[PDB]
Amino acid sequence: GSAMGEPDYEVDEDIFRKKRLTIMDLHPGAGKTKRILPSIVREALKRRLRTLILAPTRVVAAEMEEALRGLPIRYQTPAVKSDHTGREIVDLMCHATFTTRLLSTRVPNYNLIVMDEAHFTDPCSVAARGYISTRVEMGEAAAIFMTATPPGSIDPFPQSNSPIEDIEREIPERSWNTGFDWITDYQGKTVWFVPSIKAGNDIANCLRKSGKRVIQLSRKTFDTEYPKTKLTDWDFVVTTDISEMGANFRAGRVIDPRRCLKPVILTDGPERVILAGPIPVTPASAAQRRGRIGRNPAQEDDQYVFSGDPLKNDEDHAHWTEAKMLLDNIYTPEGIIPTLFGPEREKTQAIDGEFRLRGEQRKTFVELMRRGDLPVWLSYKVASAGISYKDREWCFTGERNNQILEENMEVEIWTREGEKKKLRPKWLDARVYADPMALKDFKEFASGRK
């Protein structure tokens, strides 16, 4: 047994057996990260097991470090810097980090793999679960999957440590002069989920000129701003869903529009990726966002203010295909190509081994993602055409309609050899051109400068 604070002294030996996948479905706030994880790790070390701990985001990574402080753990994430004598037997990294490692060889032969937030719909995370479950099935490892919302979750309002008041109200997606007093009149601390940084900035600036102390959180502001949510006093946290999971704010209210943009592979005509939306989030995401509050048993009157219903069907989301794209090029030390984790199979109808790439194309694929910063789909389309990483011709030889326009003007690229060409890529992926910043990156790619 254990008290609420400390981790349990007793750990089930069942979970360490090779060929065993433990699924830990426990409601948000049940101490899964802060209690259960240290228990496993402690028992991992005494058992002397080569151990992998996986966190979806730097936010979760950081909440893990607090709970594991003082244990001989190797942190391979910019979120945590700590002293390490390279003889550790426990590694901790992010889901996407592990996957890209798998694609780039040779990875420690882990006896034990702990995947926290094992519902994460990120194509790399899905791909990781395929590898992990395949390692378990070969009797090469034991694994634990931890998540409050395991695949098949439908309940947007799970149980909490404290009563939650669920309120449906219209929520502004931009600035507002009037009409939304309840936002600013509320005396406590608010966590507000936003689908984008630009939207986040608009709302943040809006709240500031109302006298409110606002910290903005996103992939770009994490390092300097996250510690501020912990040790400092503030009124609002405006956040992208970098904070969707694991985050521990001392908050009283979540504001959740439950909307976001979604990459979708279109197969009506020539195949391409658009950014569909804004569309409702899945029940799992909503439950995670609501799960940020009602965590404190001492504090009984927390609130979750939301707009609209979730949408479970995300089968048109590109991540199911992209995961298969990644997984089809991941191999086990024995030579087996992994199969998707059970509950996530047949999310799209892809042939067995349809995305396998041979020799040099695989190299290029990986390089297009890691060096090129290109989405999985685009990276795959280019690589599988037999184009090498540095050959940017495909950025200019697309059909007439693939002409990229910015500010209603045809985008011109000045190449590394002084040539002027129109940005007209053979494959369209709205992720490299929709946001102005993303387009600049892609302009640099087309230039020959990435």
Place this chain on the structure above:
RNA sequence: UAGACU
């Protein structure tokens, strides 16, 4: 979009 890494 969002995340992850160098």
